[PDB]
Coordinates of C-alpha atoms in Angstrom, one line a residue:
X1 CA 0.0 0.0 0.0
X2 CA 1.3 3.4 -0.9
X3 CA 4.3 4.1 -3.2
X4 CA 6.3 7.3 -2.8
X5 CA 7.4 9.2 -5.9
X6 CA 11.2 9.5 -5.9
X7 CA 13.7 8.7 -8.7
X8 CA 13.0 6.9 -11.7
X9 CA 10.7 9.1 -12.9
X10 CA 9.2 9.1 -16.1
X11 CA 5.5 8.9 -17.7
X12 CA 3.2 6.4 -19.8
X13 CA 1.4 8.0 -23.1
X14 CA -1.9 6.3 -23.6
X15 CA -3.5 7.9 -26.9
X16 CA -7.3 7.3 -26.6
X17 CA -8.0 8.3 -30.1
X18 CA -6.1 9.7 -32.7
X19 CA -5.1 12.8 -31.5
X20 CA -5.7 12.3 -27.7
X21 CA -4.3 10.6 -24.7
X22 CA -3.3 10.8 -21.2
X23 CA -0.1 11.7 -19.3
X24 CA 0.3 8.9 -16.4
X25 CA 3.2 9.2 -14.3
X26 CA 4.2 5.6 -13.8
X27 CA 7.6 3.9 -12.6
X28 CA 10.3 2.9 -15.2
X29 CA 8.8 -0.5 -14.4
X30 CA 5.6 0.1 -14.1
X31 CA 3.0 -2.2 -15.0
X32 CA 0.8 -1.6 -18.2
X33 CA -2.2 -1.8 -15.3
X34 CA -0.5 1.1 -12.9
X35 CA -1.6 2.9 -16.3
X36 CA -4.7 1.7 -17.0
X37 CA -6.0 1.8 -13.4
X38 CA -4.8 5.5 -13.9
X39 CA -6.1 6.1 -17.6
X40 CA -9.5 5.1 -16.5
X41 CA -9.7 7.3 -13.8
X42 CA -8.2 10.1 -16.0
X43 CA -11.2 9.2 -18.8
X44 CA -13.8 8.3 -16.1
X45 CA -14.3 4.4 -16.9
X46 CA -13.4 0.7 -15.2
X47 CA -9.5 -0.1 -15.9
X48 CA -10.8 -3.3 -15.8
X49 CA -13.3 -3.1 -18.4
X50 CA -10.1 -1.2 -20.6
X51 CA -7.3 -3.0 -21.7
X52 CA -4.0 -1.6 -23.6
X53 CA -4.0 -1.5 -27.0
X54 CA -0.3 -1.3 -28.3
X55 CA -0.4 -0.3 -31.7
X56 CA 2.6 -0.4 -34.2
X57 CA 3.8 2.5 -37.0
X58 CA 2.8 0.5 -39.7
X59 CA -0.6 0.6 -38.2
X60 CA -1.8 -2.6 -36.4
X61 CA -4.0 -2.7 -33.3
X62 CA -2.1 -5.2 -30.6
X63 CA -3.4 -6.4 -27.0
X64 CA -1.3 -7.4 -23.9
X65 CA -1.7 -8.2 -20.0
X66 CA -2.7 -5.5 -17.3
X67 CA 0.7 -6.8 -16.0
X68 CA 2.4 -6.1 -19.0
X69 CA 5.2 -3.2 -18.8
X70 CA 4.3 0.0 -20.2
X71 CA 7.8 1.3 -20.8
X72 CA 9.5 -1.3 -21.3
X73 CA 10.7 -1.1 -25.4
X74 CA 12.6 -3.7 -25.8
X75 CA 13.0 -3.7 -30.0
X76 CA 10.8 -1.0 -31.5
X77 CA 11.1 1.9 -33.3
X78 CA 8.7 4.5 -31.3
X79 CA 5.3 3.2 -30.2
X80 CA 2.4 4.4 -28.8
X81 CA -0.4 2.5 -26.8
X82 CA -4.2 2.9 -26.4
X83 CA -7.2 2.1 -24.5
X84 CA -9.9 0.9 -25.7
X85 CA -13.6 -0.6 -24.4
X86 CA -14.1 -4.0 -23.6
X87 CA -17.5 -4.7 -26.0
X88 CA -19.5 -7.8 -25.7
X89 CA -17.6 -8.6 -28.8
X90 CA -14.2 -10.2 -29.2
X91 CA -12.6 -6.7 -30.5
X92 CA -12.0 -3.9 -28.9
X93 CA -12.6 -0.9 -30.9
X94 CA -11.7 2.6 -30.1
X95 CA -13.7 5.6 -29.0
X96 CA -15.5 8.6 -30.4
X97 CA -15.9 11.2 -27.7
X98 CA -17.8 10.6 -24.7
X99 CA -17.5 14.0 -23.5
X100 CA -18.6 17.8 -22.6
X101 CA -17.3 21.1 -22.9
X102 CA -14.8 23.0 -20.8
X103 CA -13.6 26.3 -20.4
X104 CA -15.8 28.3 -22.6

């Protein structure tokens, strides 16, 4: 229980859709959940209804574990991961919106 914040600091990106995502601040060996169960707070939803979606440049949607690293890039030319919505169907899918305005 509890986990201080000192050294090895560095953050997970978790794009939600194409041109959003989340900034989690994660250890350099932080589990892909420590993201999750942050992401979904940070989009409002059930970490464990969400699941990691590491995608690839070429353009290929990819699924892991919740303890899966987040940062861990062993052999890969930049990468970013996703969340997306655990359905009642075997895929995933991204998002649309699901969301209100701010500010103005």
């Amino acid at each position: 229980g509890s986990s201080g914040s000192s050294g090895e600091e560095i953050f997970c990106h978790v794009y939600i859709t194409e041109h959003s995502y989340v900034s989690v601040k994660a250890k350099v060996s932080s589990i892909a959940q420590e993201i999750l169960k942050v992401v979904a707070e940070k989009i409002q939803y059930a970490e464990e209804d969400l699941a990691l979606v590491a995608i690839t440049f070429s353009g290929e949607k990819h699924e892991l574990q919740p303890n899966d690293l987040v940062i861990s890039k062993s052999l890969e030319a930049s990468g970013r991961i996703y969340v997306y919505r655990k359905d009642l169907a075997d895929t995933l899918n991204p998002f649309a919106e699901n969301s209100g305005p701010s500010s103005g």
